[PDB]
Design a protein around this ligand. Structure first.
Ligand SMILES: CCNC(=O)Nc1cc(Nc2ccc(OC)cc2)c(C(=O)Nc2cccnc2)cn1
Length: 187
């Protein structure tokens, strides 16, 4: 399943060699935050281009479900991230690393994956007065070629579009490599 996506990344994510696929990975993650906004629960999304070749998407919604199936021992979060608008489990499969942090019901929950494989169970890392979901991922360098770094203007252009197609949601884009910041929101 996650092996199929790794074998033929182009089918799922788009071209792996000119940066189209690389940027679609961001948009896949954002679409879920936008859905949480369409359901009324998320007011703001923050997309950050980090200086270590990762992007993070943070929403202020209800947070991804964190409960465990008792007999299976697997959290809803882990199901969401590992099982097959191509979906976030594809992003996970094509990331050398992905970090999920969930603020929900007063607790911070966290899980790390490498190439889609979880490294430990979902775990509580603190308390919080907020809710939301944060996904931060480092794209796989076995998968992506030529364009292996995120490009501000490709995300800016698309995140503006999404801002105006889903009127009311605030989308912020931040680039840690040069301090560039933008704010997209339409009345
Ligand atoms: C940075 C990316 N943001 C993000 O993933 N936000 C998000 C996603 C949520 N659910 C979800 C729904 C569908 C999905 O795959 C298409 C993956 C996750 C949910 C969600 O369904 N939360 C929820 C709803 C009802 C009860 N308990 C938790 C909330 N926020």
């Amino acid at each position: 399943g996650l092996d199929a996506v790794r074998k033929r990344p182009g089918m799922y994510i788009g071209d792996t060699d000119d940066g189209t696929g690389l940027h679609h990975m961001v948009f896949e993650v954002v679409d879920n935050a936008i859905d949480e906004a369409l359901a009324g629960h998320c007011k703001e999304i923050i997309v950050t281009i980090h200086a270590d070749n990762s992007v993070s998407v943070q929403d202020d919604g209800r947070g991804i479900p964190t409960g465990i199936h008792p007999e299976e021992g697997v959290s809803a979060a882990e199901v969401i991230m590992t099982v097959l608008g191509v979906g976030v489990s594809v992003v996970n499969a094509l990331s050398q690393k992905l970090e999920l942090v969930i603020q929900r019901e007063g607790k911070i929950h966290r899980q790390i994956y490498e190439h889609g494989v979880p490294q430990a169970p979902l775990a509580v890392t603190g308390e919080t007065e907020k809710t939301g979901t944060m996904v931060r991922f480092w794209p796989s360098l076995e998968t992506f070629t030529n364009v292996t770094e995120f490009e501000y203007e490709i995300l800016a252009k698309r995140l503006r579009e999404l801002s105006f197609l889903n009127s009311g949601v605030s989308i912020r884009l931040r680039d840690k490599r040069d301090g560039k910041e933008d704010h997209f929101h339409y009345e």
